[PDB]
RNA sequence: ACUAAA
């Protein structure tokens, strides 16, 4: 009779990967209960004794928080009662997979448990959830002996996994408490508000009988960004301005467009004076000549924010569609995990191998083959926030195989990987300064020397320009014509989906996976409508809500509130505060907000009445 | 007697109107020019001062202005930036000074970068001009070589928020 | 029906 050790992973693909590693190619695979999960069995050594290893996976959160009993039927509970009186419980997630039963039957005879879950807050929460599931069935073990384990990993290479098995740690309770508090707050504050608003506005205005008005600490600020942009667009008064341009002819039909050093002057009389003090002269002198070699930096590693931002700007894709296509590519086995914050390649990575698989594609065969002969350049050091390695290809594909919208995403990802292991562009900058009367003019121009990573990413190419003539100080060039140009300051445009993602990440609103969902939710509720080249336009209903929130209480729509509450919840994670004191205090400050909202709800009625 | 005071003010470039300012400060042993400029510096040049600038600076007829003269600033505007955002790094700074002698208004333009004058200068300070200065299209052309700020406050508030 | 996050 040999002892057994049970391991849990966060997703079956990672389970299979860590099973293939660390077992030297020996596995016994079974599918038990649910069809998604699997059990991998093998033998080995642990704590100095022979042991059998059973390792399986749990698909995401086992359980989720929801209200208990009657306090979920909308017509029989007061919304204001949701803050403190309504109890909560962690019921289940995706009930069709009996995850609790599967874990119980799997850990029937296990003596140790090692958690291979992700190194993040949600990973810790799922760790404690599975742990609570499994302890009631485990063996009683012994006295002063340590049984629960946790492993820390960020890459799926052989050496890293073996090291992570060599050194083991312990979980922490404070992070799990922090995420539990976060879940409870986001449930109550937002369920109460949505229930009140939907019950109120449906019964007073008829055009929104079947619609749903929703509030939350993640989508309301997202709507607020677009409403602020619309306010700036509609509150803009254009100005008129004058720019003075000179054309200089050097040799025969060679004409150079000079640029004014003072780029713009906003006064008619001033522009007229400068024109009158320049137009008469027919001669020019050169003052300064410059020739400086500069470089264009290669792109960093690819994370999900960058992938969505480029897919929504160049590929004409939505965020949710892009992530669904990425997930399909990942589950087929062509892209490594498509939800990461990490932009730094692990030190022990097979960079050479992954670049070799692309050597037989006609699109970039020449560049890849050359790059392996002269050596690979080191990738740029970025941010390594644990989690999973950056998005990189794993297998060779041809357009006939993937086809359609799936192929366009594959090309950009695999062009990013080749670019990040290539050389920087080296372009020469030339400037010549002129003097036509008591004014200073300048001309620019760029010529490329080594294209570098421009070859695999054509759209980031230095534009082709002629070659500023080689002229030294004291050379004389006749002037052809000088004249003004009446220009007007253009007004900005509506926010693009690419720009919004930057604003979400800058203010800490949403995670790597909730960003696509929040953008889609505000589209489904008819708050915003997508139009033209992926531009978000506030709908008449959306404008009233955000404008109404400013009059009532601004810090329900202000972006900075989300970062503030996260800071307080982080204090629990460090252990320097208490779970109930922080949760209770934050509930109290928001509870009085609902009362001030309900008794002063007439503020939005004035704005809604005109627009319905 | 104030003949010496009149000669001193004429030489220095201050052009006070009459003996009203003389009678304003009639303290004993207080007939000194070097500290009679002190009170006039804060005193409103709109209220006090004579008319010796030409009649048609803005007409464009005149070309060059001679002699050192003290004048008062009224409004400051950055003509290289839009009104919505006064500050802007997209264009080099360029100021359109509005200047006065007490009765006649004039407009001056900054060419070269000046460290003494900025947007935050008090709306009532005094600047002294030395040497020959150029007038183009009725506008003064001020450079770093012919400007001397003298400070002073004329109890004009900010009137902005 | 809701909020959020794997
Ligand atoms: Mn995860
Ligand atoms: Mn994440």
XYZ file of C-alpha atoms (C1' of nucleotides) and ligand atoms in Angstrom:
781
model
C 0.000 0.000 0.000
C 1.571 3.235 -1.259
C 0.547 6.748 -0.282
C -1.142 9.082 -2.760
C -0.843 12.792 -3.535
C -3.534 14.763 -5.359
C -2.837 17.857 -7.449
C -5.328 20.414 -8.777
C -4.791 22.715 -11.760
C -6.866 25.671 -12.930
C -7.585 24.386 -16.470
C -7.313 20.921 -18.180
C -4.745 22.044 -20.766
C -2.357 23.195 -18.044
C -3.133 19.965 -16.198
C -2.056 17.916 -19.218
C 1.052 20.058 -19.732
C 2.251 19.677 -16.141
C 1.405 15.971 -16.328
C 3.509 15.449 -19.461
C 6.298 17.305 -17.704
C 7.484 15.926 -14.349
C 6.410 12.384 -15.315
C 9.091 11.671 -17.964
C 6.421 10.782 -20.511
C 4.635 8.158 -18.387
C 0.933 8.844 -17.794
C -2.325 6.991 -17.329
C -5.233 9.157 -18.472
C -8.885 8.754 -17.518
C -12.027 10.849 -17.866
C -14.210 10.814 -14.773
C -17.717 12.144 -14.121
C -17.696 15.437 -16.005
C -16.390 15.243 -19.550
C -14.320 18.420 -19.283
C -12.060 17.285 -16.444
C -9.543 14.447 -16.545
C -7.355 12.441 -14.174
C -3.676 11.755 -14.865
C -2.009 9.047 -12.779
C 1.671 8.188 -12.411
C 4.298 7.215 -9.822
C 7.249 9.007 -8.293
C 8.959 10.277 -5.161
C 7.773 12.820 -2.593
C 8.950 13.720 0.930
C 11.420 10.833 0.657
C 9.038 7.933 0.013
C 7.565 6.231 -3.054
C 4.177 7.712 -3.883
C 1.429 7.690 -6.479
C 0.360 10.977 -8.053
C -3.176 11.757 -9.209
C -3.531 15.155 -10.845
C -6.713 16.746 -12.182
C -8.167 20.126 -13.095
C -11.009 22.380 -11.979
C -12.537 24.672 -14.605
C -12.452 28.110 -13.028
C -14.395 29.073 -9.927
C -16.152 26.162 -8.256
C -18.738 28.366 -6.534
C -20.112 31.897 -6.837
C -21.852 34.254 -4.432
C -25.609 34.745 -4.610
C -28.486 35.754 -2.372
C -30.379 33.203 -0.294
C -34.069 32.445 -0.090
C -36.694 34.983 -1.074
C -34.333 37.958 -1.297
C -33.883 37.354 -5.060
C -37.512 37.737 -6.242
C -37.615 41.314 -7.474
C -41.201 42.166 -6.546
C -41.211 41.061 -2.886
C -37.995 42.528 -1.422
C -37.161 46.169 -0.839
C -33.940 47.037 -2.721
C -32.635 49.034 0.245
C -32.863 45.799 2.246
C -30.129 44.184 0.123
C -27.282 46.029 1.857
C -27.263 44.374 5.273
C -30.359 42.243 5.892
C -30.127 39.933 2.864
C -27.708 37.040 3.506
C -25.384 35.580 0.896
C -24.000 32.134 0.159
C -21.580 30.531 -2.294
C -23.882 28.179 -4.186
C -22.226 26.824 -7.369
C -20.929 27.769 -10.829
C -21.809 25.964 -14.079
C -23.896 23.374 -12.192
C -23.914 20.924 -15.098
C -20.354 20.018 -14.073
C -20.589 18.382 -10.661
C -17.263 19.886 -9.609
C -17.766 19.396 -5.868
C -18.801 15.767 -6.337
C -15.877 15.155 -8.690
C -13.387 16.596 -6.211
C -14.906 14.574 -3.370
C -14.745 11.301 -5.294
C -11.209 12.055 -6.497
C -9.835 12.879 -3.059
C -11.343 9.831 -1.376
C -7.990 8.336 -0.417
C -5.477 11.139 -0.873
C -3.005 11.862 1.927
C -1.490 15.128 0.648
C -2.717 17.980 -1.542
C -0.576 20.284 -3.699
C -2.297 23.227 -5.372
C -0.943 24.111 -8.825
C -3.248 27.084 -9.256
C -2.441 30.478 -10.733
C -0.265 32.901 -8.773
C -2.808 35.683 -8.310
C -5.723 36.765 -6.131
C -8.334 34.701 -7.969
C -5.976 31.735 -7.930
C -5.705 32.018 -4.152
C -9.489 32.235 -3.800
C -9.999 29.097 -5.892
C -7.203 27.457 -3.897
C -9.071 27.953 -0.637
C -12.382 26.947 -2.233
C -11.013 23.617 -3.493
C -9.186 23.191 -0.189
C -12.394 23.578 1.829
C -14.023 21.130 -0.574
C -11.351 18.457 -0.123
C -10.377 18.484 3.579
C -13.632 16.850 4.830
C -12.807 13.702 2.810
C -9.003 13.493 3.163
C -7.270 11.137 5.567
C -6.780 12.382 9.120
C -2.986 12.316 8.518
C -0.992 12.772 11.763
C -0.053 15.293 14.441
C 2.468 18.085 14.002
C 2.886 17.317 10.299
C 2.286 19.690 7.395
C -0.041 18.414 4.679
C -1.366 21.280 2.535
C 1.019 22.614 -0.117
C 1.125 25.340 -2.750
C 3.430 25.751 -5.739
C 4.473 29.000 -7.414
C 5.014 29.005 -11.168
C 4.925 31.371 -14.125
C 6.293 29.342 -17.073
C 5.653 25.833 -18.343
C 9.240 24.872 -19.106
C 10.771 21.664 -17.776
C 13.388 23.314 -15.566
C 10.918 25.796 -14.082
C 8.332 23.121 -13.278
C 10.953 20.857 -11.703
C 12.239 23.764 -9.601
C 8.677 24.610 -8.537
C 8.274 21.027 -7.351
C 11.654 21.225 -5.606
C 10.578 24.263 -3.555
C 7.062 24.471 -2.100
C 5.218 27.066 -0.035
C 1.933 27.693 1.761
C -1.250 29.617 0.929
C -2.381 32.846 2.569
C -5.832 33.549 3.994
C -5.775 37.336 3.663
C -5.843 37.349 -0.145
C -8.843 35.009 -0.160
C -10.592 37.244 2.361
C -9.809 40.256 0.165
C -11.370 38.736 -2.936
C -14.378 37.550 -0.908
C -14.940 41.105 0.324
C -14.565 42.394 -3.236
C -17.181 39.945 -4.519
C -19.643 40.784 -1.745
C -19.293 44.546 -2.238
C -19.666 44.372 -6.010
C -22.735 42.185 -5.554
C -24.645 44.338 -3.076
C -23.618 47.772 -4.338
C -24.918 47.422 -7.866
C -27.618 44.825 -7.361
C -29.511 47.229 -5.108
C -29.026 50.140 -7.512
C -29.982 48.178 -10.634
C -33.091 46.781 -8.955
C -34.231 50.227 -7.829
C -33.595 51.915 -11.175
C -35.271 49.180 -13.221
C -38.307 49.068 -10.933
C -38.629 52.864 -10.956
C -38.069 53.917 -14.563
C -40.130 51.107 -16.099
C -43.274 52.232 -14.286
C -43.055 55.933 -15.156
C -41.888 56.064 -18.798
C -43.388 53.762 -21.407
C -40.640 53.735 -24.035
C -38.468 51.658 -21.665
C -41.027 49.034 -20.651
C -38.918 45.981 -21.536
C -35.492 47.602 -21.159
C -33.106 47.152 -18.230
C -31.242 50.038 -16.600
C -28.109 48.725 -14.897
C -25.590 50.282 -12.517
C -22.222 49.075 -11.321
C -18.722 50.012 -10.190
C -17.181 48.904 -13.503
C -19.556 49.782 -16.351
C -20.915 53.118 -15.113
C -17.459 54.788 -15.308
C -17.016 53.237 -18.755
C -20.212 54.959 -19.863
C -18.990 58.090 -18.098
C -15.881 58.245 -20.272
C -17.960 58.311 -23.459
C -20.392 60.828 -21.963
C -17.471 63.095 -21.028
C -16.129 62.821 -24.569
C -19.554 63.739 -25.960
C -19.725 66.745 -23.633
C -16.312 67.919 -24.838
C -17.391 67.475 -28.466
C -20.615 69.430 -27.969
C -18.946 72.177 -25.905
C -16.268 73.159 -28.436
C -15.935 76.549 -30.135
C -13.550 76.528 -33.124
C -10.876 79.175 -33.621
C -9.281 80.503 -36.807
C -5.527 80.708 -37.289
C -2.880 81.502 -39.888
C 0.257 79.558 -40.845
C 2.940 80.973 -43.141
C 4.546 78.625 -45.679
C 7.452 79.158 -48.058
C 8.477 77.264 -51.187
C 12.177 77.288 -52.088
C 13.522 76.073 -55.434
C 17.096 74.771 -55.336
C 17.975 73.104 -58.662
C 15.677 73.194 -61.711
C 12.391 71.459 -60.732
C 13.440 70.617 -57.154
C 11.057 72.397 -54.765
C 11.184 72.234 -50.963
C 8.240 73.025 -48.682
C 9.573 75.048 -45.758
C 7.896 75.051 -42.348
C 7.597 78.057 -40.055
C 9.487 77.891 -36.765
C 6.581 79.634 -35.038
C 4.027 77.062 -36.110
C 0.865 79.120 -35.652
C -0.273 82.684 -34.976
C -3.887 83.362 -34.012
C -4.091 87.047 -34.984
C -4.937 88.459 -38.399
C -2.839 91.597 -37.943
C 0.189 89.659 -36.681
C 0.029 87.228 -39.596
C -0.331 90.144 -42.011
C 2.695 91.893 -40.507
C 4.856 88.789 -40.845
C 3.699 88.287 -44.436
C 4.428 91.936 -45.256
C 7.910 91.661 -43.724
C 8.798 88.546 -45.763
C 7.054 88.569 -49.158
C 9.244 91.289 -50.673
C 12.557 89.458 -50.345
C 13.703 87.173 -53.156
C 16.707 85.483 -51.520
C 17.462 82.969 -48.765
C 20.343 81.878 -46.527
C 20.981 78.614 -44.692
C 21.977 78.760 -41.028
C 22.129 75.295 -39.453
C 22.595 71.821 -40.910
C 22.063 68.663 -38.873
C 22.558 64.934 -39.390
C 21.705 62.716 -36.411
C 21.331 58.934 -36.377
C 18.319 57.726 -34.394
C 16.591 54.423 -33.692
C 13.021 53.123 -33.533
C 12.400 50.746 -30.642
C 11.177 47.215 -31.267
C 7.808 46.265 -29.745
C 7.619 44.552 -26.367
C 5.965 41.210 -25.683
C 2.281 40.865 -26.523
C -0.363 40.979 -23.793
C -4.126 40.750 -24.089
C -4.660 44.516 -23.793
C -2.366 45.128 -26.765
C -3.971 42.285 -28.717
C -7.460 43.720 -28.228
C -6.277 47.269 -28.929
C -4.717 46.300 -32.253
C -7.581 43.976 -33.231
C -10.140 46.736 -32.617
C -8.151 49.306 -34.626
C -6.515 47.545 -37.595
C -8.315 44.196 -37.943
C -11.846 45.575 -37.538
C -12.803 43.238 -34.698
C -14.740 43.682 -31.491
C -13.149 42.874 -28.133
C -15.441 39.936 -27.345
C -15.128 38.547 -30.876
C -11.342 38.862 -30.685
C -11.153 37.041 -27.358
C -13.503 34.296 -28.563
C -11.346 33.767 -31.656
C -8.222 33.754 -29.481
C -9.786 31.141 -27.199
C -10.679 28.978 -30.193
C -7.104 29.233 -31.462
C -5.761 28.364 -28.006
C -7.979 25.314 -27.551
C -7.041 24.102 -31.023
C -3.391 24.494 -30.030
C -1.872 27.344 -32.041
C -1.474 30.114 -29.417
C -0.172 29.943 -25.844
C -2.793 31.507 -22.974
C -4.587 34.591 -24.352
C -5.264 36.398 -21.042
C -2.051 37.760 -19.524
C -0.703 40.948 -17.984
C 2.900 39.823 -18.522
C 5.099 41.489 -21.146
C 8.428 39.820 -20.265
C 9.651 36.520 -21.665
C 10.854 34.006 -19.057
C 14.622 33.699 -18.806
C 14.592 29.971 -19.636
C 12.448 29.975 -22.777
C 12.784 28.202 -26.128
C 12.886 31.336 -28.259
C 14.935 29.674 -31.000
C 12.587 26.715 -31.387
C 9.380 28.704 -31.792
C 11.019 30.893 -34.431
C 12.178 27.774 -36.285
C 8.661 26.408 -36.841
C 7.834 29.469 -38.969
C 10.695 28.823 -41.410
C 8.391 27.255 -44.016
C 5.773 29.938 -44.633
C 6.111 31.901 -47.902
C 5.001 35.184 -46.308
C 8.088 35.602 -44.098
C 10.360 32.690 -44.998
C 13.299 34.888 -46.013
C 13.336 37.068 -42.892
C 13.101 34.127 -40.483
C 15.845 32.157 -42.240
C 18.256 35.098 -42.214
C 17.558 35.912 -38.570
C 18.633 32.457 -37.385
C 21.952 32.699 -39.253
C 23.117 35.950 -37.626
C 21.629 35.233 -34.202
C 18.549 36.435 -32.355
C 18.420 39.762 -30.553
C 17.521 39.761 -26.879
C 13.871 40.600 -26.134
C 13.133 43.827 -24.314
C 12.672 43.611 -20.553
C 9.150 44.573 -19.542
C 6.701 43.676 -16.775
C 6.509 40.181 -15.262
C 3.301 40.127 -13.215
C 3.324 36.376 -12.660
C 0.297 34.734 -14.288
C 1.237 33.205 -17.676
C 3.895 33.821 -20.337
C 3.091 36.324 -23.092
C 1.045 35.447 -26.156
C 3.277 33.555 -28.604
C 2.690 30.992 -31.369
C 3.259 27.279 -30.872
C 2.571 25.649 -34.255
C 2.884 26.416 -37.949
C -0.291 27.295 -39.816
C -1.275 27.989 -43.409
C -4.150 30.213 -44.510
C -6.046 27.235 -45.938
C -6.194 25.583 -42.508
C -7.510 28.355 -40.262
C -9.214 30.544 -42.851
C -11.257 33.687 -42.428
C -11.081 35.906 -39.369
C -9.055 33.353 -37.396
C -6.092 33.701 -39.758
C -5.815 37.493 -39.574
C -5.340 37.321 -35.805
C -2.742 34.562 -36.178
C -0.678 36.637 -38.611
C -0.495 39.630 -36.283
C 0.503 37.527 -33.273
C 3.164 35.638 -35.217
C 4.443 38.832 -36.845
C 4.785 40.344 -33.372
C 6.948 37.436 -32.209
C 9.353 37.780 -35.134
C 9.506 41.558 -34.695
C 10.316 41.352 -30.981
C 13.391 39.218 -31.750
C 14.713 41.429 -34.569
C 16.821 44.590 -34.748
C 15.712 48.177 -34.266
C 15.118 50.453 -37.227
C 17.956 52.924 -37.796
C 16.838 56.059 -39.641
C 18.821 59.219 -40.344
C 17.193 62.565 -39.559
C 18.178 65.607 -41.623
C 17.191 69.203 -40.874
C 18.104 72.366 -42.781
C 17.303 75.801 -41.346
C 16.620 78.802 -43.583
C 16.206 82.559 -43.148
C 13.886 84.396 -45.553
C 13.874 87.887 -44.096
C 13.800 88.307 -40.324
C 12.260 84.832 -39.930
C 13.556 81.308 -39.375
C 12.290 78.345 -41.393
C 13.073 74.644 -41.168
C 12.697 71.547 -43.330
C 12.720 67.889 -42.318
C 13.354 64.551 -43.994
C 14.022 60.899 -43.182
C 16.040 58.180 -44.908
C 16.246 54.576 -43.741
C 19.502 52.678 -43.218
C 18.634 49.213 -41.854
C 14.912 48.330 -41.993
C 15.223 45.886 -39.099
C 11.812 44.850 -37.790
C 10.036 46.988 -40.392
C 10.140 44.028 -42.799
C 7.862 41.830 -40.682
C 5.639 44.748 -39.562
C 5.168 46.946 -42.651
C 2.699 49.373 -41.069
C 5.355 50.694 -38.660
C 7.632 51.847 -41.469
C 9.476 55.135 -41.850
C 7.815 56.904 -44.803
C 9.852 57.281 -47.974
C 10.956 60.873 -48.582
C 13.341 62.390 -51.150
C 16.768 63.308 -49.853
C 17.196 66.846 -48.553
C 20.011 68.217 -50.785
C 23.447 68.387 -49.191
C 24.021 72.091 -48.541
C 26.523 73.785 -46.243
C 26.374 77.102 -44.410
C 26.435 80.173 -46.627
C 24.750 78.569 -49.634
C 22.179 80.788 -51.347
C 18.831 79.578 -52.705
C 16.234 81.784 -54.437
C 12.730 81.811 -52.958
C 9.713 81.059 -55.119
C 6.534 82.053 -53.302
C 5.367 82.745 -49.743
C 1.722 82.933 -48.711
C -0.594 82.431 -45.764
C -3.014 79.553 -45.195
C -6.258 80.182 -43.319
C -6.856 77.072 -41.200
C -9.378 76.250 -38.477
C -9.022 74.123 -35.356
C -10.873 70.875 -35.989
C -13.065 69.365 -33.256
C -12.205 65.925 -31.862
C -14.163 62.748 -32.620
C -15.991 60.196 -30.507
C -13.982 57.724 -28.459
C -12.664 54.665 -30.264
C -12.624 51.228 -28.671
C -8.824 51.327 -28.824
C -8.664 54.535 -26.782
C -11.176 53.327 -24.191
C -9.127 50.238 -23.303
C -6.190 52.472 -22.378
C -8.458 54.508 -20.102
C -9.818 51.380 -18.397
C -6.337 50.051 -17.644
C -4.951 53.438 -16.591
C -7.658 53.906 -13.947
C -7.680 50.255 -12.873
C -11.249 49.611 -14.039
C -11.631 45.942 -14.919
C -9.163 43.094 -15.365
C -7.728 41.465 -18.507
C -10.903 39.408 -19.040
C -13.625 41.796 -17.857
C -12.625 44.539 -20.314
C -14.290 42.841 -23.335
C -17.375 42.013 -21.273
C -17.894 45.545 -19.944
C -17.634 47.054 -23.431
C -20.210 44.573 -24.721
C -22.607 45.015 -21.785
C -22.913 48.769 -22.284
C -23.627 48.057 -25.956
C -26.345 45.519 -25.121
C -28.176 47.861 -22.731
C -28.452 50.411 -25.586
C -26.257 52.842 -23.652
C -23.860 53.244 -26.600
C -23.923 52.311 -30.278
C -20.930 51.294 -32.378
C -20.547 53.163 -35.651
C -18.095 54.057 -38.439
C -14.533 52.896 -37.694
C -15.213 51.419 -34.244
C -16.305 54.623 -32.510
C -18.534 54.569 -29.426
C -21.383 57.091 -29.586
C -23.445 57.782 -26.444
C -27.130 57.015 -26.906
C -29.804 59.440 -25.732
C -30.562 57.179 -22.766
C -26.907 56.973 -21.740
C -26.373 60.739 -21.677
C -29.129 61.315 -19.111
C -27.831 58.687 -16.680
C -24.284 60.040 -16.444
C -25.417 63.674 -16.438
C -27.990 62.777 -13.800
C -25.356 61.110 -11.632
C -23.243 64.276 -11.533
C -26.102 66.321 -10.069
C -26.955 63.711 -7.439
C -23.551 62.438 -6.302
C -20.482 62.676 -8.520
C -18.405 59.894 -6.962
C -20.747 57.185 -8.251
C -19.453 57.762 -11.805
C -16.018 59.216 -11.089
C -13.242 56.814 -12.180
C -11.044 57.406 -9.129
C -13.468 55.718 -6.712
C -12.690 52.244 -8.066
C -8.978 52.615 -7.330
C -9.769 53.943 -3.847
C -11.868 50.960 -2.751
C -9.272 48.547 -4.159
C -6.620 50.231 -2.006
C -8.669 49.705 1.159
C -9.333 46.073 0.240
C -5.608 45.599 -0.405
C -4.917 46.506 3.238
C -6.778 43.338 4.229
C -4.524 41.312 1.929
C -1.396 42.582 3.674
C -2.948 41.599 7.017
C -2.736 45.096 8.525
C -6.521 45.451 8.860
C -9.567 43.337 9.735
C -11.990 41.666 7.344
C -15.284 42.737 8.910
C -14.207 46.244 9.922
C -13.208 47.192 6.371
C -16.191 45.447 4.774
C -18.630 46.870 7.314
C -17.278 50.405 7.000
C -17.411 50.378 3.193
C -20.976 49.049 3.251
C -22.037 51.862 5.591
C -20.646 54.657 3.415
C -22.460 53.251 0.375
C -25.677 52.463 2.272
C -26.333 56.146 2.960
C -25.641 56.805 -0.728
C -28.668 54.726 -1.724
C -30.936 56.626 0.670
C -29.698 59.954 -0.701
C -30.247 58.591 -4.210
C -33.799 57.337 -3.648
C -35.161 60.441 -1.912
C -33.566 62.732 -4.528
C -34.222 60.604 -7.629
C -36.273 63.470 -9.087
C -33.062 65.008 -10.431
C -32.908 62.590 -13.351
C -36.648 62.913 -14.019
C -36.151 66.461 -15.310
C -33.547 65.293 -17.831
C -35.340 62.065 -18.776
C -38.627 63.847 -19.506
C -37.312 65.753 -22.528
C -35.719 62.662 -24.088
C -37.794 59.689 -22.829
C 11.500 123.892 -6.219
C 11.080 120.959 -8.613
C 13.290 121.879 -11.583
C 15.877 119.265 -10.597
C 13.112 116.685 -10.159
C 11.692 117.485 -13.589
C 15.093 117.198 -15.232
C 15.771 113.928 -13.412
C 12.455 112.373 -14.434
C 12.911 113.496 -18.041
C 16.404 111.982 -18.130
C 15.301 108.753 -16.431
C 12.285 108.220 -18.701
C 9.395 108.726 -16.288
C 6.939 111.264 -17.696
C 4.726 112.241 -14.759
C 1.979 114.711 -15.659
C 2.135 117.717 -13.347
C 2.803 118.957 -9.812
C -0.247 117.049 -8.590
C 1.984 114.067 -7.887
C 4.459 116.513 -6.330
C 1.794 117.755 -3.909
C 0.648 114.175 -3.279
C 3.890 113.469 -1.370
C 4.679 116.746 0.410
C 6.442 115.183 3.384
C 9.385 117.132 4.846
C 12.723 116.421 3.151
C 10.912 114.186 0.643
C 11.712 115.954 -2.627
C 14.031 113.175 -3.851
C 13.489 111.726 -7.311
C 15.101 108.379 -6.483
C 12.239 107.658 -4.079
C 9.603 109.697 -5.914
C 9.647 107.046 -8.649
C 8.956 104.561 -5.843
C 5.392 105.736 -5.195
C 4.594 106.309 -8.876
C 5.625 102.726 -9.650
C 2.596 101.413 -7.749
C 0.431 104.431 -8.602
C -1.801 104.070 -11.650
C -0.173 105.472 -14.777
C -3.713 105.665 -16.156
C -4.495 108.236 -13.467
C -1.122 110.021 -13.437
C 1.092 110.879 -16.402
C 1.467 113.181 -19.408
C 0.817 112.729 -23.133
C 4.022 112.655 -25.195
C 3.573 109.541 -27.354
C 2.525 110.308 -30.952
C -1.127 110.400 -31.987
C -1.056 107.677 -34.647
C 1.042 104.707 -33.528
C -1.629 102.328 -34.832
C -2.135 104.158 -38.143
C 1.039 102.626 -39.587
C 2.515 105.972 -40.652
C 5.270 105.934 -38.019
C 8.330 103.711 -38.408
C 10.771 104.117 -35.496
C 10.368 105.199 -31.871
C 13.180 106.931 -29.988
C 13.996 107.723 -26.387
C 13.611 105.709 -23.188
C 10.020 105.786 -21.956
C 8.061 104.035 -19.207
C 4.716 102.462 -20.080
C 2.079 100.357 -18.339
C 0.963 96.848 -19.293
C -2.782 96.167 -19.440
C -3.528 92.745 -20.966
C -1.448 89.648 -21.716
C -2.382 87.058 -24.330
C -0.502 84.105 -25.816
C -1.199 84.462 -29.538
C 0.478 81.112 -30.254
C -2.085 79.041 -28.324
C -5.879 78.716 -28.445
C -8.079 80.438 -25.896
C -9.411 77.165 -24.452
C -5.960 76.154 -23.164
C -3.661 79.102 -22.503
C -0.680 76.799 -21.960
C 0.493 74.770 -24.945
C 3.847 73.188 -25.773
C 2.945 72.742 -29.453
C 4.033 76.308 -30.257
C 6.796 78.568 -28.948
C 5.549 81.253 -26.594
C 4.647 84.578 -28.196
C 3.133 87.528 -26.343
C 1.028 90.462 -27.534
C 1.565 93.161 -24.928
C -1.009 95.922 -24.585
C 0.769 99.063 -23.413
C -0.398 102.512 -22.383
C 0.907 105.918 -21.376
C -2.264 106.972 -19.553
C -4.285 108.157 -22.540
C -3.143 106.320 -25.688
C -3.089 102.547 -26.172
C -0.492 100.644 -28.192
C 0.251 97.031 -29.098
C 3.674 95.387 -28.853
C 4.836 91.975 -30.052
C 7.476 89.694 -28.562
C 9.950 88.076 -30.967
C 12.720 86.600 -28.814
C 12.133 84.566 -25.679
C 11.888 86.788 -22.608
C 12.443 85.570 -19.054
C 11.285 88.775 -17.343
C 7.754 88.794 -18.830
C 5.323 85.870 -18.761
C 1.578 85.262 -18.636
C 1.543 85.561 -14.835
C 2.870 89.128 -14.858
C 0.623 91.476 -12.852
C -1.854 93.271 -15.123
C -0.492 96.644 -14.032
C 3.304 96.500 -13.978
C 5.550 99.006 -15.736
C 8.144 98.386 -18.439
C 10.805 100.853 -19.570
C 11.955 100.953 -23.189
C 15.454 102.106 -24.118
C 17.076 102.856 -27.441
C 15.401 102.944 -30.833
C 12.568 100.446 -31.255
C 10.942 99.374 -34.513
C 7.294 99.768 -35.515
C 5.922 97.465 -38.207
C 2.311 97.799 -39.378
C 1.596 99.955 -36.355
C 2.876 97.322 -33.919
C 5.872 97.666 -31.614
C 8.628 95.059 -31.995
C 10.104 94.294 -28.569
C 13.268 92.245 -28.045
C 15.410 91.325 -25.052
C 17.880 94.160 -25.685
C 15.395 97.029 -25.173
C 13.125 96.020 -22.276
C 13.469 96.613 -18.532
C 10.690 95.455 -16.211
C 10.229 97.642 -13.136
C 7.534 95.788 -11.188
C 4.893 97.495 -9.093
C 1.278 96.699 -8.207
C -1.743 98.892 -8.938
C -4.194 96.929 -6.732
C -5.741 95.139 -9.708
C -7.063 91.773 -8.538
C -7.067 88.511 -10.488
C -10.793 88.647 -11.374
C -10.561 85.063 -12.607
C -11.437 81.630 -11.250
C -33.535 39.252 -14.592
C -29.029 41.973 -11.195
C -23.460 43.034 -9.834
C -18.304 41.009 -10.587
C -14.538 37.569 -11.819
C -12.151 32.931 -13.152
Mn -6.519 32.099 -14.144
Mn -5.171 39.053 -14.786
